């Protein structure tokens, strides 16, 4: 064939820390269907937001928003335990169906996105050029968010481990840990990946007693 229908830009959702995660790559022939399992960002999370995006940027904010919906009623559990199946299905007419289903509860929510939605030809070409001109920066952003999410998860895990230990943790140890948790919390608000990792290292250096 010399011609066929494609979806012109990548399609996906916003994940923890403002990153776009792709479900359907740009230029995929349509009709197409792809599913991916996601989970919760923190412990005891009973609801997730499914924000549908079109574009090639790593920051969710830089892509075209196609719509959003919430999935509620997830049983509060440790982070990473829920299995949230997200499906993107584009039919032959270019109509996009997005669904999210929590495997444990059976709870499901969906949205239908019209084929006329998203970016036009000129905006598509600008999107592609802007992504290539910002490839290094977008990569650094993505690496920064992965570190931030690890740091955020370390902050929560340490805090829970401290309370679970309680009296067994010596005074001098507990104070050094609380001070390093504050230094990590501050570093997480910045955009320097190595500064966050160094604060995670300093926290680990004062946390041997909890281990």
């Amino acid at each position: 064939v010399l011609l066929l229908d494609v979806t012109p830009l990548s399609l996906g959702i916003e994940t923890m820390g403002g990153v776009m995660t792709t479900l359907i790559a740009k230029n995929t022939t349509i009709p197409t269907k792809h599913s991916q399992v996601f989970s919760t960002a923190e412990d005891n999370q009973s609801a997730v937001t499914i924000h549908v995006l079109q574009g090639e940027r790593k920051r969710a904010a830089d892509n075209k928003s196609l719509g959003q919906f919430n999935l509620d009623g997830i049983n509060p559990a440790p982070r990473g335990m829920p299995q949230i199946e997200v499906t993107f299905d584009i039919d032959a007419d270019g109509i996009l169906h997005v669904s999210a289903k929590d495997k444990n509860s059976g709870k499901e929510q969906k949205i239908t996105i019209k084929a006329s939605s998203g970016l036009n030809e000129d905006e598509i070409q600008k999107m592609v050029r802007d992504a290539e001109a910002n490839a290094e920066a977008d990569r650094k952003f993505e690496e920064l968010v992965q570190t931030r999410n690890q740091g955020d998860h370390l902050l929560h895990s340490t805090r829970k481990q401290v309370e679970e230990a309680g009296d067994k943790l010596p005074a001098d140890d507990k104070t050094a840990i609380e001070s390093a948790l504050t230094a990590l919390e501050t570093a997480l608000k910045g955009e320097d990946k190595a500064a966050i990792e160094a604060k995670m290292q300093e926290l680990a250096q004062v946390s041997q007693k909890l281990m």
Binding site: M16, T40, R79
Partner: peptide, 7 residues
């Protein structure tokens, strides 16, 4: 699995 934001 990748994490999702909460409402």
């Amino acid at each position: 699995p990748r994490p999702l934001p909460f409402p």
